[model samples]
Target chain A: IEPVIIETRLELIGRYLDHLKKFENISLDDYLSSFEQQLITERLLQLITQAAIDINDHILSKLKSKSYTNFEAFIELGKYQILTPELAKQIAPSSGLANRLVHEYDDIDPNQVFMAISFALQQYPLYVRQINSYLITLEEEND
Target chain B: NIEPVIIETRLELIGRYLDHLKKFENISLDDYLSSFEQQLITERLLQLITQAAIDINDHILSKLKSGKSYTNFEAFIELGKYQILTPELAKQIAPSSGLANRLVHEYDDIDPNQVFMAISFALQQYPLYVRQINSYLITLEEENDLE
Candidate 1:
């Protein structure tokens, strides 16, 4: 692949986002046990996050071109065009999710659990859609 | 205490206990969060099933008329069979993710409080699972010494 600078960050994001979705179709060996499935699911998630990180940074670069930068800024810019206030909060929910997964605070509550699961899943497909639509636009522009 | 607060507090506690499960189950800030927690619950329950099987073996061994042993998956199935876990769960002894899939993607809107009850029920029904795992080399040493 040629390394031409992408005119829009959305294109890069779209590419990686597509890879992430494609990666989800992967599985461990056919004869593998349940434990192997967990390992495979784990590998897929890691690759998805790696792509997410790249997309996050590339989007940041694009947003900086538009005079928007940083995770917070990228989120805000996304909303300026597509993301709603509620949706913007989900950009790297993995940050909070990672924190919660690694740390155990006594303050945990069911509402937090309820919101975490409810909001996160709701937020995920929307992010996927946003990236997919952006990719579609990029393809249209190229055509 | 009214049911709602108790439900809330317990769910919060359950939430509080897990750190990143919200993300894994594709759940967070939305209905999808249940999906993530459901996965965690399934994996954890399988471990419990494994442990319970070992404990039952230990109890049976001490009173045994003959020596006994089993391979990994076989032990899991035997333990699950003895504990009377649902036939579905028992069958899934090796493919534990089935429980997560059944609960998360297939089932619709399980209650928060009810989910807690399910785990509690799991523990109550399979108490030995929590009790039997001995990671201590010391226990092995003692057994060898006795021999």
Candidate 2:
């Protein structure tokens, strides 16, 4: 019922995106060879994924939609047109990857981590743009 | 070496959340449905309790076996399979993960009755889960001593 202030979360995501920029051109060997790089990458990925999920839940709550899983949070954003369906589907799996990073339930594949960083670099900016656009519409309606 | 401390901390968190949920254990459906604040508090507590349990399950399973849990529900099922929890107890408590997922993602169409029932379930079942896990930890400590 309360308005979820997303500006702070969006800022957090932006900061993480800036941190991840360094890895955009990183080679897999360089990423894998350095445990510190891998740790930084994994932590950033988890933070980005969680911030996105938090934003999704806040928007969904405002819309009064039925809740689902973290993976479904992205898909629900697509259904509401806050994100393109294609982008939503692409990023939804980040929730699972985030879970893996947090739980360390298995040995994460370095190749997978490398590719996820590449995807995050391109896609999360689009995610931020779409959400900002949606928030603007909400503001205009209030006026 | 410090893994047990992590488990203890998680259990402590679960205990705190469960304590919060206990206030609503006896809440009437009409009163619960009418109060949006109560509903929100109950839903959030359930989510935290379930997530904490899943975290504990994952930590223990990763250390003891090579298998992975792909879903929150599977984490409990894996514990059951490994006999860390009795199969019956695991099956009984596994649905809490699903309930927690719904509580987290969906806002509308949540049945008040179901939320109320989940409160009872958490209060009744999670203590047993903690007890079983503590017993397993004792065995683990003994094994470490032997090694």
Candidate 3:
């Protein structure tokens, strides 16, 4: 496994995590007219998705685990035994919402946007913590 | 006739806009002006940054314009005459409107050096604009309360 690629994936994850910190206590409706708030929130979600995809691609390529979609990439985590089943399940919903954000801007429900923000505030950090745990396990196995 | 809500809302957008641009301020000049990713960011950021200023200008002029047509640059000048911005501060950022114009019209043909200069200088003025406008909002609200 190439360390550089894995490290770059970690860096992207960290970047999005820092970006997500900006949404704390923000008033969502302040963006109704300019949609700048919505645009920023959507992009942060998309970046987190991109980072997850990059990490999964790196792991799956090494493990020879093939997956059909990003949410399935969590299943790949289980198949490779990289993350706990409960944690993988916890992170799965965001992958689907990430796709909706990119593809369904015109018809997206406001309730779900609120849902996505709450998930980012709470769940994404858990996702990062699990990723970090996975990285540590890989190092131990190699040693 | 000034609405505090409008001023406050525009100020918030400008704050976020400045936050977006400041993220790129640390890239080396060569990488900043040359990288494809940076160029795309520069293009998108320039539009948003300038649009915030233009939007604030429009909000002001809409309240005061008794039906005369003035471009964005003219609106900033009008802001000076009304004392929202000191003439010196208005002059400092007046060229921003021209940068905004060139960005809109001559986008593909823009000089990289010019793009670099405008964004660097524009970031400097964000605080000044925010300060002046916040002060204006306070005065307007106080007067509104008195009446």
Question: Highest TM-score: which candidate?
Answer: 2
Q: Candidate 2, which segments miss by more than 4 Å at Cα?
A: A1-143, B67-69, B106-109
Residue-wise C-alpha lDDT for candidate 1, range A1-143, written one tens digit per residue = 11133223334434434433432433334313343233223322322333444455565565455543334653664665645566666555544443332222333233343334434444555665665566567667788
Give interface RMSD, every candidate, in order: 9.9, 12.6, 9.1
Please write out the lDDT profile of model 2 over residues A20-98, one tens digit for every residue.
Answer: 8877898888888864466567767866887888888788887855767989989988987889999999989988987
The fraction of reference interface contacts (C-alpha pairs within 8 A across chains A and B) present in each candidate is 0.00, 0.00, 0.00
lDDT of 3 by residue, B35-111 (tens): 53455456546655666677777877776788888987888788888898878778887778777665543333467
**lDDT per residue (tens digit) for residues B27-116 in model 1:** 332453344434434444433343334433344333322557754445445545554234444454433333333332233333444444
Q: What TM-scores do the predictions have?
A: 0.31, 0.52, 0.49
Best by lDDT: 2
TM-score of chain B of each: 0.28, 0.89, 0.86
B53 in model 1: Cα distance from truth in Å? 27
Worst 10 residues of 3 chain B by lDDT: B101-110
What do the candidate models score in CA lDDT, each in turn?
Answer: 0.41, 0.79, 0.69
Q: By the lDDT metric, which is better: model 1 or model 2?
A: 2
Winner on DockQ between 1 and 3 is 1
The pairs that clash in candidate 2 are A66-B106, A67-B105, A67-B106, A67-B107, A68-B105, A68-B106
> Could you tell me the lDDT of residue B88 within candidate 2?
92
